[PDB]
Structures are given as structure tokens and as C-alpha cells.
Ligand SMILES: *[C@@H]1O[C@H](CO)[C@@H](O)[C@H](O)[C@H]1NC(C)=O
Ligand SMILES: *[C@@H]1O[C@H](CO)[C@@H](O)[C@H](O)[C@H]1NC(C)=O
């Protein structure tokens with residue numbers, strides 16, 4: 001069979017750039033600046049060791065973002081920022097100050113009725 | 116005030132709503148375009164098949180129109196049913212939040228959004244609802260030595276509510292979600308067991324409200 | 332699924348006919364993508380509710396509560412708690428066969444190793460920071476002083492734990508042990524997951540086998556039919572293939588939509604538990620599982636999640652006249 | 655491969671995020687026809703004596719090559735039709 005999967009055009013908004021990085025899904029970078037991924041053959045995005053927040057989800061952890069001149073990059077998504085709680089047998093941390101935050105939450109209720 | 120700035124420039128936060136309105140008009144569009152498709156018949160105009168041919172042939176063709184269009188409905192319809200239930204579950208969730216969050220105070224965690232929940236203010240939106248969740252988020256923390264228990268005379272003292280803490284010297288019992296130290300007296304602490312069993316009990320002296328009240 | 336390539340296998344003759352059904356081919360991709368998108372939204376909602384990745388401290392003193400079972404295994408190349416390996420062995424060619432005809436399996440956005448970092452974080456904060464990490468910045472608290480609260484949650488005064496700690500330690504640990512064999516010695520516990528994976532691979536097999544059906548057409552092979560049957564007449568034949576196959580997709584697609592809508596419901600149930608049960612302490616009776624609930628430990632499993640609910644069940648009764 | 659995304663999006667402004675546009679399949683460089691006498695059509699079709707239909711003659715034929723050209727070039731034949739497979743195409747697909 002053919003490589004298939006599908007072509008995928010990774011782009012920052014057309015407003016930002018007209019540059020795109022093409023992802024060939026689930027293929028070998030032969031039959032096509034090239035990089036081989038877990039999700040397939042990616043073209044036109046420079047691999048970046050610096051792991052950042054997942055921005056444009058691609059596959060298998062590969063997440064692309066536009067910033068650095070500039071070029072679309074591809075990098076292993078860092079899940080979260082890292083922390084290690086400083087923990088002891090009697091160590092406790094009790095908040096002395098707080099905030100009151102208003103977080104919008106949005107839900108559908110009904111949809112357009114038709115006949 | 117931050118909310119109104121967000122909405123002022125945010126098209127995305129309504130993505131949930133904007134998607135629902137889209138997906139309907141989408142399938143509505145596609146439903147319409149299916150009126151222009153041949154479906155194998157010689158044309159997608161109903162009458163133009165007729166006036167071209169003598170009807171005993173049209174009876175055959177109009178099948179491939181009907182068989183096509185009738186299907187395209189059942190596709191669209193079966194979609195709506197599925198999509199309806201998707202809204203249906205969302206509507207049930209809205210009733211649950213409207214009921215519990217707004218009309219109550221939700222002990223459930225992160226059902227009303229991050230932080231401990233105070234109240235919610237619903238706001239209507241086209242084919243939807245928008246809650247403003249007012250939540251209580253702690254902020255500034257201070258590392259503090261703690262103990263699960265305090266010996267006094269060999270009795271053990273445990274806090275009624277909150278925990279024994281200490282900056283480094285004076286043991287204070289305080290409520291948990293806010294730092295409000297108070298000197299430790301019997302009204303703060305109840306007696307149980309004795310000093311052997313607890314793991315982590317310290318020494319200290321639990322002041323007595325009553326003892327001074329006597330002395331005169 | 333590739334609608335054009337699936338229905339009409341490398342043949343323009345059939346491919347042109349498909350254009351006369353209009354947007355069926357495209358709206359199927361629009362349908363399946365809607366599924367495929369929210370799948371990585373489900374896994375997103377469930378596992379990552381936590382802002383930061385916490386990690387357990389270097390040295391484990393919890394007051395006797397062994398966690399080496401459930402905590403990430405530092406010696407595995409993919410760090411996954413000892414238990415999670417029991418799971419990934421139970422759950423399980425279809426590797427390229429489907430991928431012949433345009434049936435593709437896209438990689439889940441989050442690799443399993445990432446899922447195991449979340450369920451490490453959620454489990455790292457649960458242990459050290461109590462429940463506060465879901466409400467904001469995590470607050471280190473002595474684990475034994477955590478469990479004093481989670482008893483106050485269920486109405487047992489904390490003086491029970493400070494006195495019974497050693498006992499409660501053993502009951503906990505010995506309870507964790509049997510969770511291994513509960514999984515290790517029986518393969519039906521994971522049926523829920525196993526059923527999901529099967530039904531997916533099921534319909535795919537069915538969807539493939541539909542390629543070999545005549546559907547009233549002289550031959551199931553499209554290339555052979557185009558090569559032998561005369562273009563004038565072969566048109567009508569290929570219809571019965573297309574009409575058959577094109578229908579047979581909508582059957583498969585509709586199944587996936589319906590089936591995903593179930594998972595979509597099950598995902599929220601997890602995300603509800605993950606938020607309320609793991610991150611907080613649940614007051615909802617038998618929502619977290621039978622008994623008064625203390626805490627829950629998430630554990631990843633293939634295309635699923637597994638919670639270890641630590642619950643408080645009373646035992647020995649004493650008849651006593653009351654007033 | 656970028657302009658196809660605008661057609662799929664149906665918007666001159668393609669907002670951020672990944673879009674599936676099209677699928678690419680490698681073209682076959684060339685064709686392999688790998689077949690492994692003469693068939694007695696001059697002995698069947700120019701035969702001198704056909705039996706009737708109560709005892710019709712049957713001749714199993716294999717291990718030879720088809721002269722399907724002059725079948726169509728004969729053109730002295732009243733009723734000649736092929737069911738399922740078309741006669742002209744059957745020149746090369748074989749049996
Ligand atoms: C592009 O986006 C920026 C914000 O990032 C906005 O200020 C600008 O007006 C946008 N331009 C267009 C062409 O919409
Ligand atoms: C194809 O992909 C595999 C795995 O990445 C790689 O080992 C191989 O060299 C690639 N090329 C061939 C020969 O298919």
C-alpha cells in the first residue's frame with residue numbers, strides 16, 4: 001500500500017505568516033528542511049530541542065509553534081512546567097493571602113430548532 | 116473588569132457556542148447542496164428530467180434522485196439526533212450547574228472551576244448560558260513547622276479545626292485555608308489518648324482560659 | 332478513513348462517479364475528524380487538570396504508607412508505576428491491513444509516557460500537597476496530617492488516625508498488594524477497556540470485509556470490474572458497489588459517532604472523578620466506590636484510566652441501648 | 655500544499671492550527687504484464703459439422719493463445735454480445 005495517512009498543513013494564522021510546515025502523516029521521508037517524527041514526515045519546520053508548551057498539536061507529543069528570521073518549529077511538548085514540592089515530615093505551608101477570581105465558564109443549552 | 120476586557124477582544128472563549136451554531140449551519144448547508152447532486156440520475160433538477168423524457172423512464176430516474184435525497188436526509192437527521200443528545204448532555208450539565216453552583220454552593224471540587232467556589236452568576240448567550248464563577252483562590256504561603264499533636268500533662272491535644280503550627284518557637288493552631296494564628300487553649304483543642312501513641316507529637320503547654328480566671 | 336480511496340480503490344472511473352454523490356465523501360471526514368479531535372480533548376480534560384508537573388520528593392517517608400507500588404518506577408525506561416505495567420500487558424494483522432484501504436490509525440496526541448507524567452503529577456501532588464493543588468499552588472503538608480483531614484471529611488475524628496496510624500499503615504499496604512493480584516490473576520477486570528478496543532477493531536474488520544461483498548455487483552474487485560465490464564454498463568454495476576460501500580461507511584461512521592458519544596460521557600465521568608475524587612475528597616456516597624471515601628490514586632491504562640479508591644469501611648458492631 | 659488548505663478551509667484567512675488538506679499516493683513507474691500454441695478457433699469457428707442442441711458438442715480449451723482480434727474483424731455474424739465482461743476489452747485480460 002501507499003504511505004497514505006494524510007497531508008497536514010501546519011500553519012500559524014495567515015495573519016501572522018504565509019509560511020506553512022507540511023506534515024506527511026505516517027510515512028518514511030523518502031518518497032517525498034526535513035525532519036522525521038513519530039507521526040510522520042514533517043517538512044519546513046526546524047526541529048527545536050527546547051521543549052515548550054504544546055501550541056499547535058500534531059501527534060505523539062510533537063507540537064509546533066511559530067516563533068523563533070522566524071520559522072515554524074517542532075518540538076516535544078513539555079506537559080506543564082515542572083515543580084517539586086518541598087516536603088518534610090512536619091513541613092506545612094498555609095496560605096496567608098488569597099485572591100477572588102472570576103472564571104467564565106460557557107456551555108451550550110439549546111440548538112437551532114428546525115423542521 | 117477583566118472579564119469584559121477578555122470578551123472585548125476574545126472570539127475564542129465562545130468557541131463552544133460558535134462551534135454549535137456553525138456545525139448546524141454546516142450540516143444545513145451540506146443538506147442543501149445535496150439538492151444539486153446527480154446521485155447517478157441524469158440531472159439534479161427534478162422537472163428537467165421529466166420534460167426531457169417520457170415519464171415511464173422518469174419513474175426510474177426519480178428513484179436515483181429520491182434514493183439519493185431521502186438518504187441525504189436520513190444522514191442529516193441521524194446527525195441531528197446524535198448532535199441533539201450532545202447538547203442534551205450539555206443542557207443536563209447546565210441544569211446541574213445552574214442548580215448546584217448558582218442556587219447552592221458546590222462542595223464538589225472543580226465542578227464550578229478552579230479554587231473553592233463562592234457563587235456563580237449566570238449570563239444568557241445565544242443558544243447557551245455563561246456562568247461567572249466567583250472562586251476563592253489562596254495566594255501567599257509561608258513554610259511552617261507543624262505537629263499533629265501536642266502533649267501537655269501527658270494527655271494529647273488535637274485541634275478541633277485546623278492544625279498546630281509554629282513559626283519556629285510558639286505553637287499556634289490555625290484554620291487551614293487561611294493563616295490566622297491563635298494561642299492554643301482548651302477551646303481550641305480536645306483531649307484524646309495520651310502521649311505514647313501519636314507519631315510526631317511535641318511537648319509544649321496549652322494555655323488554659325479558666326486557670327487565670329480563678330486566681331482572684 | 333479516506334473516503335475516495337476506500338470506496339474507489341485507485342480507479343478514476345469509480346472516482347468520477349463518486350463526485351455525483353456530492354459531499355458524502357467530504358462530510359464523512361468532517362464527521363470522523365470531529366471524533367478524532369475530541370478524543371485528544373477527552374484525554375486532555377481527564378489527565379491534565381494540573382497546572383504544573385509535580386514530582387515526588389527523593390526520599391519516601393509517608394508514615395508507613397508504601398507508595399512504591401503506585402509511584403513511577405525510576406528504573407523503567409518509560410517511567411510507569413509497577414501497577415501500570417500489569418495493565419499494559421492485559422490490554423492489547425490489524426497493523427497495516429486496515430491501513431491498506433485508507434483506514435488509518437492516527438497517533439494519540441499524548442504519548443503514553445506523557446500520560447504517565449500527568450498521573451505522576453496528580454499522584455505526586457495528592458500525596459505531598461493534599462487536595463490544595465487543585466485549588467491553586469500546591470501546599471506541602473505532612474501526609475499523616477493529610478489523612479487527619481480526610482477522616483474529618485467522613486466524620487471520623489482525627490484522633491482515630493493519630494492513634495491507629497501504624498495499623499492503618501498495614502491495612503493500606505496489604506490492600507495495595509492485593510490490587511496487583513486482582514489485576515495479575517484475572518484478565519476480566521479490564522473488560523471495560525478491552526471491550527472498547529475490541530469494538531473499534533471489530534467494526535474495522537467488518538468495514539474491511541464489506542469491500543469483498545458483491546452488493547449485487549458482478550464482482551467485488553473494482554479494478555477487475557472496470558477492466559472487464561463495458562464502460563456503458565459497468566457504470567450501473569459500480570453504483571451497486573459504491574451505493575453499497577458508500578452506505579457501508581455511513582453505517583461505520585454513525586456507529587463511531589454513537590460509540591464516541593458514549594466514551595464522551597464516560598470521559599466526563601472520569602474528569603468528574605479525577606477532579607472531585609482524586610483532587611478533592613468526595614462527599615457523594617458511592618460515587619468513588621463503596622464506603623466512605625478517603626483518597627483516590629489515578630493510574631493510566633491504554634485508552635483509559637484506572638482509579639485506586641482508598642475507602643473507609645467500618646467493621647465490628649456492638650449492640651448498645653441508645654437515647 | 656499551502657493553497658489547498660485555503661480551499662479546504664473555504665476562507666482567505668486560515669486561522670492558526672493544523673488542517674488536513676489532501677492525501678499523496680506514489681504513482682506506479684510502469685506496468686508489469688507477466689504471462690507464464692494457438693487456440694483452434696479455425697477448427698471451431700470454421701468447423702464443418704455442428705451437432706444439434708439435444709447432443710451439443712463441447713470442447714474444453716486451454717494451453718494456447720487467443721486470436722480475439724479477427725473475432726471482431728469477422729463482422730459477418732448476426733448476433734454477437736458478451737455478458738458481464740465486454741468483448742473488446744477481453745483481448746488482454748485472460749482465462
Ligand atoms: C493580526 O493579529 C494581531 C494580534 O496578534 C492584530 O493586532 C492584527 O490586527 C491582526 N491583523 C489582521 C490582518 O487581522
Ligand atoms: C523507514 O523507516 C524506518 C523506521 O524509522 C527506518 O529504519 C528505515 O531506514 C526507513 N527507510 C526505509 C528503508 O524504509
Ligand SMILES: *[C@@H]1O[C@H](CO)[C@@H](O)[C@H](O)[C@H]1NC(C)=O
Pocket residue numbers: 049
Ligand atoms: C538536539 O537533539 C539532537 C538529537 O539528535 C542532537 O543531535 C543535537 O545535538 C541536540 N542539540 C542541542 C544543542 O542540544
Ligand SMILES: *[C@@H]1O[C@H](CO)[C@@H](O)[C@H](O)[C@H]1NC(C)=O
Pocket residue numbers: 088089090392
Ligand atoms: C523526619 O524523620 C527523619 C528520620 O526519623 C528525621 O531525621 C528528621 O529530623 C525528621 N524531620 C522532622 C522535622 O520531623
Ligand SMILES: *[C@@H]1O[C@H](CO)[C@@H](O)[C@H](O)[C@H]1NC(C)=O
Pocket residue numbers: 097098
Ligand atoms: C494581600 O495582598 C493584597 C494586595 O493588594 C493586599 O492589599 C492585602 O492587604 C494583602 N493581605 C492583607 C490581609 O493585607
Ligand SMILES: *[C@@H]1O[C@H](CO)[C@@H](O)[C@H](O)[C@H]1NC(C)=O
Pocket residue numbers: 086093256257258
Ligand atoms: C519552602 O522552602 C522550599 C525550599 O526549596 C522552597 O522551595 C519553597 O518555595 C518554600 N515555600 C515557602 C512557602 O516559602
Ligand SMILES: *[C@@H]1O[C@H](CO)[C@@H](O)[C@H](O)[C@H]1NC(C)=O
Pocket residue numbers: 317318
Ligand atoms: C518533653 O518533656 C518531657 C518531660 O515532661 C521530657 O522527658 C521529654 O524528653 C521532652 N521531649 C519530648 C520528646 O517529649
Ligand SMILES: *[C@@H]1O[C@H](CO)[C@@H](O)[C@H](O)[C@H]1NC(C)=O
Pocket residue numbers: 395396397398399400
Ligand atoms: C514497599 O514494598 C516494597 C516491596 O518490594 C519494599 O521493597 C519497600 O521497601 C517497601 N517500602 C516501604 C516504605 O515499606
Ligand SMILES: *[C@@H]1O[C@H](CO)[C@@H](O)[C@H](O)[C@H]1NC(C)=O
Pocket residue numbers: 648649650
Ligand atoms: C444484636 O442483637 C441481635 C439480636 O440478638 C443480633 O442478631 C445481632 O447480631 C447483635 N449484634 C451485635 C453487635 O452483637
